[PDB]
Design a protein around this ligand. Sequence first.
Ligand SMILES: *Cc1c(COP(=O)(O)O)cnc(C)c1O
Ligand SMILES: *Cc1c(COP(=O)(O)O)cnc(C)c1O
Lengths: 400, 400
Amino acid sequence: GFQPASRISSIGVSEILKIGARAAAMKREGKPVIILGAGEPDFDTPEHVKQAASDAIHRGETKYTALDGTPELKKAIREKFQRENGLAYELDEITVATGAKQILFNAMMASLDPGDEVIIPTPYWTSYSDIVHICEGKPVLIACDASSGFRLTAEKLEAAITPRTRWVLLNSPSNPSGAAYSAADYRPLLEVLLRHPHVWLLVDDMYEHIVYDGFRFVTPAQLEPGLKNRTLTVNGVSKAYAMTGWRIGYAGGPRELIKAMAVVQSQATSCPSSISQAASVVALNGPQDFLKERTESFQRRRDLVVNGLNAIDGLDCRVPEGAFYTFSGCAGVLGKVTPSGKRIKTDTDFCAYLLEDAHVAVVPGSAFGLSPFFRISYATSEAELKEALERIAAACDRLS
Amino acid sequence: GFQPASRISSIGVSEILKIGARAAAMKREGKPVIILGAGEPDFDTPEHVKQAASDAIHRGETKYTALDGTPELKKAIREKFQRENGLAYELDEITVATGAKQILFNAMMASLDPGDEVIIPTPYWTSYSDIVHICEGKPVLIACDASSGFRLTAEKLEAAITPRTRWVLLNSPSNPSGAAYSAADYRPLLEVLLRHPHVWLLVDDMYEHIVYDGFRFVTPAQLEPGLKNRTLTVNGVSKAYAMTGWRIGYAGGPRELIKAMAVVQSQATSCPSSISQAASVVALNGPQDFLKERTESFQRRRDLVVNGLNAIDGLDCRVPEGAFYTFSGCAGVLGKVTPSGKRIKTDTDFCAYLLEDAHVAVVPGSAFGLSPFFRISYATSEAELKEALERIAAACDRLS
Ligand SMILES: *Cc1c(COP(=O)(O)O)cnc(C)c1O
Ligand SMILES: *Cc1c(COP(=O)(O)O)cnc(C)c1O
């Protein structure tokens, strides 16, 4: 009889998976369901990156690499940080792993002891707290509502820090709100952190290259040199280059942390795929102009969803600054009754109604730690979004 | 300053890496050291496997897959276990990870609580005990000397089992010994394990397809159906297909352990590379005849090393059954003096003399937990092996 380790005892089944399972069963019943939960861009890997992978395969780059990345890829990353972020890292301050997921995992495994706290602003994707839990740490969730654009404030950060705080997670743009920090937004938070030298910064910049309206992306180790010696700047090719299947993430940070992360990586995975690494060299080093057209395509779909929802009675949707999610408010539908007699008390109730009665799957704000809201991923076709918006509107109009 | 987590406090630097670094420095100095430490086969990924990868890239198989493997790869693994090992595993009993390294890591992370014991027969590679350490377990090392062919015996396994024993590691063929368990070798251990239902079997079959002399490969869950509900059968494409850089390992085992491993994998890596998975489908489903020529090439090189060492007074080398390592005794050189006046007291001293004065780098048995021996990897060219054996013989002749 199998007995799971205690370290996974606090990891449950995500509400997102439960929703996915219900939608899947409904399809088996013969009920087509639109699921608005895409977690990867609906673009392919760029052709020149595909060709670089094929060339590496042909040349026989099929052997183990250096544990935490080829020198060539580390140099491509160093150049990316300098070119794109005005951020200077040495080669021994750079690490490469199997996705940004493993970057985050390695960093927590390399640092957290039982009871160590990690401050996580919400709304947030629970994947972050599951990583903290398996490393025996304590997630400390800090709710940030629309009044601060879903962003952490200096006052809330200061009040959240305790003797056990080891990290603060700063993820911008984020899943599910799409909120991004400008330099003005970051500065008061970095001032707080300058006064807390034992608190390290876990910076997740994965949506850097999906930002809208001309937003100038910045990152804390760039803005505040006084925090560079305790910041892990996490990034990767998954979202920027539509390379989620390739599993390459990377980071820049202090050499002693990078060294500890390599100890974890040596136990967990050894080196990431040599083929994906070779692909990622050319993703970073090659032409970048194609990113503009993809951003414009995402932004057109952002506007479609935001404007669609703000034409529906009961909903109020802010304009996300980046990533490919909307996090619309739905306070206006609470208290209404469905045609079948059900009272809509929570955003959970509302999303369950949209699923069963409108055959559209969205995720309630309750699952991300802030209500009353719901998340749409618009990394899908304009046609599917238009149909889903029509169904959501019709279902909202049937509430009374 | 950075404080590493307690969970890596027992993981140090491997003596193998220190030896490789010193050998590498000598070569930079113009001393043409032959380093006999290859841990991957010196063949390339088969052409048809390369083509399948390039085809999958071109088709756009660049997205996240199912967390623990595509249905196509799980089906190919299911057929491999049935066709090659007579083992019947369901789809929910199969998992795919970033190398067999991650299979082992996930299994230990999913099961071990602090203080849980894992029995590790020695001679062993400390990579196994490092994994147990980072999962907060206690490696229980059981030395198996040449009198049992470097294999675990029933009496030693029975004596080593305690209430806290969670796993016994059964790795056949072995790095560093090259020894493999026949059915007759396994049977008394399996009889012991039937009497201890709390002990699970961690079966590392990675060198399955590098076995010699017509050896009939067998694996515990096939040999003893009464243990299949608590055996993890670990395997992978790295060694069989020369695909170490692609990072794909897999396992068959009880559904509840497979489920818990997926919880770990979701925090550590998400899915392994979609491209490597597609290559591995064809590695497993494709033609296997090429393995014959590779085995014959490996066996010729094995014979070079065994016969070469046994022509040197003071060395006694057993014939390995599989993998590409010899683990020769060197008791007959202990007590002798080098031309520079150093007395050779340990296999450590002997190997340092071979490095500095014969310009051949091998690893002493002390590094694997059994003396007096030394390990050679013969996954290199016959010419390089013949030259290395000449140098070892000359250096042994100069002893007094
Ligand atoms: C996609 C994503 C990740 C995971 O990246 P992978 O490299 O695919 O593992 C981590 N953080 C954020 C904010 C992401 O969008
Ligand atoms: C090579 C090897 C491993 C590691 O396999 P990867 O898939 O490359 O991580 C594990 N066990 C044994 C016996 C091996 O030979």
